Design a protein around this ligand. Sequence first.
Ligand SMILES: N[C@@H](Cc1ccccc1)C(=O)O
Ligand SMILES: N[C@@H](Cc1ccccc1)C(=O)O
Ligand SMILES: N[C@@H](Cc1ccccc1)C(=O)O
Ligand SMILES: N[C@@H](Cc1ccccc1)C(=O)O
Ligand SMILES: N[C@@H](Cc1ccccc1)C(=O)O
Ligand SMILES: N[C@@H](Cc1ccccc1)C(=O)O
Ligand SMILES: N[C@@H](Cc1ccccc1)C(=O)O
Ligand SMILES: N[C@@H](Cc1ccccc1)C(=O)O
Ligand SMILES: N[C@@H](Cc1ccccc1)C(=O)O
Ligand SMILES: N[C@@H](Cc1ccccc1)C(=O)O
Lengths: 441, 441, 440, 440
Amino acid sequence: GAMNWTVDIPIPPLPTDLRTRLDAALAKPAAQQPTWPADQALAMRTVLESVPPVTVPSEIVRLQEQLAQVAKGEAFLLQGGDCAETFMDNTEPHIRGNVRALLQMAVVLTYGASMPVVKVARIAGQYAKPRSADIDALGLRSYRGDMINGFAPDAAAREHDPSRLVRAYANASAAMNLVRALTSSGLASLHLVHDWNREFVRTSPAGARYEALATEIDRGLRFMSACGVADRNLQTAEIYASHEALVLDYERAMLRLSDGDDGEPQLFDLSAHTVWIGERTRQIDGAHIAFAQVIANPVGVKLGPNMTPELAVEYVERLDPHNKPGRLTLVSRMGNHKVRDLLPPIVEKVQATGHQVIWQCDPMHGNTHESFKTRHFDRIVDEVQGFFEVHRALGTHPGGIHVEITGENVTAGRYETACDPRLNTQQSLELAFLVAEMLRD
Amino acid sequence: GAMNWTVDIPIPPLPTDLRTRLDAALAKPAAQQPTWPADQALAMRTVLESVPPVTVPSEIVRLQEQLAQVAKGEAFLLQGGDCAETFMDNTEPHIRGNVRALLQMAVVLTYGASMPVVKVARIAGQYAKPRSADIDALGLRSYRGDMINGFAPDAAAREHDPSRLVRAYANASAAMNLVRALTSSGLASLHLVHDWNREFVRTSPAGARYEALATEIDRGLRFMSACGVADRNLQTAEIYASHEALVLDYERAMLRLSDGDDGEPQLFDLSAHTVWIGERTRQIDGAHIAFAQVIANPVGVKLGPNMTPELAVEYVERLDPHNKPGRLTLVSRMGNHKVRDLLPPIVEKVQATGHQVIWQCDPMHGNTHESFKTRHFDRIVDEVQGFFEVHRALGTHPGGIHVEITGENVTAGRYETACDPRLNTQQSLELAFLVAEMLRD
Amino acid sequence: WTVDIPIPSLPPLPTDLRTRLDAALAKPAAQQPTWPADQALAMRTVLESVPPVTVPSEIVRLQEQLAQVAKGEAFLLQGGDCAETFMDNTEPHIRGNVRALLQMAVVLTYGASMPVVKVARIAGQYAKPRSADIDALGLRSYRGDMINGFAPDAAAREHDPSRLVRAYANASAAMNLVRALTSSGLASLHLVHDWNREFVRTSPAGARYEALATEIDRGLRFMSACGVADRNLQTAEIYASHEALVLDYERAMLRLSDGDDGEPQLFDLSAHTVWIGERTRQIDGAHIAFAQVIANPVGVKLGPNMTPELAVEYVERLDPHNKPGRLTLVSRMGNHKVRDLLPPIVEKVQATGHQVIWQCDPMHGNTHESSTGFKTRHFDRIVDEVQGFFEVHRALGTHPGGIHVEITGENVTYETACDPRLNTQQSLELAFLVAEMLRD
Amino acid sequence: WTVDIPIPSLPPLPTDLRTRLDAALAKPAAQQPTWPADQALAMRTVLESVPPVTVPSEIVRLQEQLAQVAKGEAFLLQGGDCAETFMDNTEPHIRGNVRALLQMAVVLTYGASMPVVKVARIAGQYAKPRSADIDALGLRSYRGDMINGFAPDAAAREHDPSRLVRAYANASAAMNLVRALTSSGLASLHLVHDWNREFVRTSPAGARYEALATEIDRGLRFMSACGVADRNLQTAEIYASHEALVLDYERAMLRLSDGDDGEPQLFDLSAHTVWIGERTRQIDGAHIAFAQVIANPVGVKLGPNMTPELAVEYVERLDPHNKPGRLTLVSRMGNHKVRDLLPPIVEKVQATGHQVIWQCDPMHGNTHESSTGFKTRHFDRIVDEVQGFFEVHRALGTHPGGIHVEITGENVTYETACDPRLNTQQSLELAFLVAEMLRD
Ligand SMILES: N[C@@H](Cc1ccccc1)C(=O)O
Ligand SMILES: N[C@@H](Cc1ccccc1)C(=O)O
Ligand SMILES: N[C@@H](Cc1ccccc1)C(=O)O
Ligand SMILES: N[C@@H](Cc1ccccc1)C(=O)O
Ligand SMILES: N[C@@H](Cc1ccccc1)C(=O)O
Ligand SMILES: N[C@@H](Cc1ccccc1)C(=O)O
Ligand SMILES: N[C@@H](Cc1ccccc1)C(=O)O
Ligand SMILES: N[C@@H](Cc1ccccc1)C(=O)O
Ligand SMILES: N[C@@H](Cc1ccccc1)C(=O)O
Ligand SMILES: N[C@@H](Cc1ccccc1)C(=O)O
């Protein structure tokens, strides 16, 4: 035990069809991958290839059904969590933080939309982010998430390390065990959760505003206890896991094949329930999009300001070839100032295809004035506002949102994140309220 | 079949103790009984003594538990229905009217009190009312309900007729079968019921006011459907039956003895679930109050303006000798103008006894200016207002209310009742809203 | 000592559905009462506006369960008094027959390993046909309390239409009670079997059944250990039924659904399901015409004279829309004749495409007429018909649907005012026996 | 080819509870690893702040079910791998042992006619005592993957404290999966018994069990016909357990409840329940001292050398508060010695007032050591102990609580890296046999 734990490499074949496809996909050019040696990556993949999965097909299929309801406009999608999971914060309080944070948004939003909210946390493997420049502001190789290199500002720590593939799984599966433990404990009781909201509402300086709704919601709660409905849901509370499918070494290693009680056998990425593809890795003929086609998980794709209705439709037809509403989620990150002019044309040409995607709003990644990397709240709310305004007009469904938040209240002073200043626990709850009023009108 | 159906007189003894008691009770002087011959009343009682009961002990015991919660201040009592059931209106639409009417009050009030509402309809035997003068305004023997004589304004019809004891049961048990059928059908689905309220709220000229709450309530509903709670209550909807225990010939004939899975054997009045005793028949040493002591049903007693804290306490100790919270309900009918000064002293001296009664407000019987017999709405609301104001101050629980209403919208013009102009379907729903706001504050 | 009791017509039924009804009842009716039309009209008018015994949503739901019964996924269990009398229309008598029925349900539910739809011969069985116009004492035959009285006197035996109203008052009072009982602890699955377990200790025919009687207990206890909400369940929905004989009563009780569902259609709210008897099933008579007009799930008695071709004609009049379970063909041949006579029918009927429910009635078809004056039925002959009834079906791979039984809660052997039958302890014993038939 | 993997201490545990802990661990410990204290400290520090394998509300709920187990209303079912290896810490292996366990649960649940609390030997069983300091090949004895490695080489056999962290990573990954599986269709009661029914067709020891195997099916089908919500249920709560041997690991995993319930108390969140082995139960040793400090439901192995007086001393150290089910005394005597040795203990223990759970461990106490080199256990000798274990209890009218079994999903016979045992088909077979013991 020389300052670090030592795991040892492990000394049933794929259907020919899925082997060929998976191999054809990975053969394609891949953006933003790590630059460590394949000989070593091969070893880590081997270790990983027969570890216990983070999630299981049955849950992924159940997600797929819930997502449909969302896609069909009878439910709502709340995806949110850390901007970037760090191995260092992979702790019980942190994980309990983001869950408490995510659930508090769910009750409010659920009462807002007057329909079920699907809860997808950014968690259990959000360990790898993409970057534009390979060298960063200090003259070092960019930090690309704990799965690839280290935050520490020195070249040594920034050297891409294959070991971090395994270390990433260890942490992910351990975080995922707690989230299972938490959601199925009383941590997820509907009213133990709304106590917190009424707490926030008294202590918040900017609580006056929500005093209103937060009361109305408590009456909706106490009312359903009145009509004789015991927590005995009620449905047991479900938080699904997700992260950007970036590191294809990692993502492939965690592929597992289904048995055969759901049509035919097929590949499932069991590093999470749902995964999406980023703006900087969505090349239409790319390996990421190809990989998206091969797995049976629900998949989202980010859509930036240079997105064209034509292209958007190409994604919808490759990623959802069988027309299964909810399989595909089109995540919009335009930026408040553009989102109203850019989105509507994209939405018409898409709806026209007959396919039913989930229109999720990403109000984060769009808006950044760079004060550190500052993001003004009003700008975030504004984008989700416009995002609704677009769907209302065209008569489609504003499917859900994608927020980057945390449990520890962050701002100089409090800059704790290993990436970007986002919304703090407070702001995100406060955003949940504002967005709840948008669902009302 | 000479213009009328002919039933034929029927050609297991009481425990000595209950025989003696019941006989001692009836031996006492009785106010407001009918003046037909005992030889004939004996015959009707015989017929009745072995007919199928309207209610069964198990339901009465279950009521007793629900009433406790109400008495303990964790539930609310909504008692209401026809002022006076008539054999002529004992029809499917009428009965469906009062139930629809009673349930619509229940959802609103339940959302108001943010706790369960017990639903007791005046029904299935509210066929006998008391009167002050034996001769009435036209020079005829007073009409005392279809169980005793007839509404028709002629001496012939006013002759007290024993047959009406049986005719009263036939109708009661038939009405009670429908109410069972109705509440267990979809007639009692929570949302099929609130559709009506949102209907009333658009069509009502005076709906603006409630547009507010009626919306908030619909969101509380849609919210509990969101959190994944199927009507599959939910508790199946329960409406209990009740009426003024006035005609002791009738009431005794419908006594039945319990088996022995609830302590010892004891007498139950199975003409209804709960019955109360009127202002004009509550003589403390009276036969009605004695009869109240003998049966194991929950019993209410009306309390007029001449009621004294001392007397009130005597009722509480005779009618609730074992301290079973909820057995006894003290119904207040003071009159808005007096209720605030008269009630509070009564409430203190009672609470002081350690017993826990249900404080139900009767805002009807108090207020009558006699334009017909006119009752102004604002005066009714005012009494329930003051009734709350009293309990709030002393810190006790405003237990429930007792309203006299109907399904057909009544006012000259529309005077349809066989007794008093009360609240119409509309006014009573409107009263349910006003009273819902009193529970909120 | 009797006591006559006195007596505003709401809106009448649609003119269009009425014309159809009229056209229907215009057919000749069999075995009807011989009272004045005028008096009979008055009484119909009373009942035209009373509270109904059942309601439409109940019937529309029964039909749904009857669909599964007919699709070979559930079992029918019809049973109750041979003849309801007004005098026994009491609390212990109904408590009894409800109890006997539920006990049978529990054992057959476990035996068939599928839901048992519980239909009770109750709240309305107050009329019976008579092939004897003058009886054995030389009085006008007794035709049920809905028509005349059992008392062997000329006066009592004269058909009184007020008995229409008296019949209602008792049917609604009786139904008010089964509702109450069935929705309280009287239909608690656990409490219900306790009565069976004690039947196994206290019967001489006990050692035979103790085996299975224990198995059922461990099934019950097994699901308590699994922690399944008592709080079902379905509580124990018991539907009401009777033979639809006196037409004046059944038409007064015709009501129209409100039509927030489907369209507007006639229902007979005197009951949930009704059937039409062996002697009143004339294909072009008023009774089948009636069954056509009403929406209720309907049944027909089939005897030894039945010809598969006619049995088909019923499948086409009654279930023209092919709604599975709408029509239940009840078989009452006789153990000796069941095995030979039934199959040809099944085949011809199954060939129509329609899905009927196949119920067995081993009661009427098996009756000996004892040597001590008292009429009687034999128990083995009864079990046997049900046995053969199953064998017939097993062979053709069709679904033996259920049984129709004339039983009682009181342990009697002759305190009935009609035909003989089984007793509490005998029907329970039968359920056990039909229970083993289901297992194979 | 291996791969080392690198490594902010949150607030430490209360000073007051720490002093108690210190005082406790100061006692001498048996069968502990011989690594450097410094290195062992580093590793403890890692684990001092990781995510826990269980959480307190889970343990506080298990305790509640264990209270009923001890009050003779439920049954304990402990079972799983003899020794978890890191290399078999795979998806098919855990799917297997979870499956084997649930199958056993179904049969015993029905047999005992009462809830069975399912506790799995999983997610943490990575250490074992050794009465042999040098093994048969002359290498430092293998002491579990948590301590050293199975590979017969000197290097691998040296105690490495990084195995503390590796042990956690696998225990949490493994627990992450049982959660997933147990909350999906893998613990569907119906789907679970399907695997049993097929065991009755495809076993040679089938005709023996088909009887009961059918009964269980009809129990299942009976409750489907009653219309009980699948949607339980409890889904199938499977608790994690292992022998608490390596103390450095168990103390790192000590966490403090947040105290919105009760007071603040120590829990060992490395598992749900843990037990203390025959060789490390020294009354004044560190291992019992540990059991005192932690709140988890605890158990102790009792062998042939046990003296009722000492057994009592356990009842008083461990369950000083008399919380029913807190302490489970496990018996591993031996079929030949169970019947004579156990009773005196029960009596002396029941006499204290305290309510312990009485679990039976017919695994260690029954082992022959075969004549072909391979160590082995005999199956009949195993059933017998459980038999006698029941007889002992029946006689004294005390409650035989449950069994502890070393089993597996894979049908093996010697692919384990530890002691011998039963196989999937053998444990299932045992559950059936213990199932009939419960019925009498
Ligand atoms: N997150 C810490 C501790 C840890 C190790 C392994 C699994 C889970 C957590 C690390 O990587 O060192
Ligand atoms: N039954 C609710 C419980 C819940 C709601 C919101 C937050 C947390 C828990 C659900 O599953 O949605
Ligand atoms: N992980 C393998 C594919 C695979 C998936 C599932 C089972 C077996 C193999 C690869 O990347 O090529
Ligand atoms: N209410 C009517 C009809 C009726 C009769 C009997 C019972 C129920 C209703 C009457 O008394 O005449
Ligand atoms: N579950 C509710 C249903 C209901 C509420 C209000 C009115 C009607 C029905 C109750 O029993 O109270
Ligand atoms: N009805 C009887 C009393 C009684 C009640 C119940 C059973 C028997 C008798 C009476 O008034 O005297
Ligand atoms: N069963 C008696 C009394 C009764 C009358 C009306 C309804 C129910 C019962 C009869 O019918 O004559
Ligand atoms: N819910 C069960 C209850 C029951 C079954 C059988 C007998 C009695 C009661 C049913 O209605 O089928
Ligand atoms: N089971 C392998 C790989 C693994 C590592 C970490 C957690 C789970 C599995 C080992 O422990 O060496
Ligand atoms: N709810 C049952 C489900 C179950 C029982 C037995 C085996 C498998 C599953 C239980 O946890 O007890």
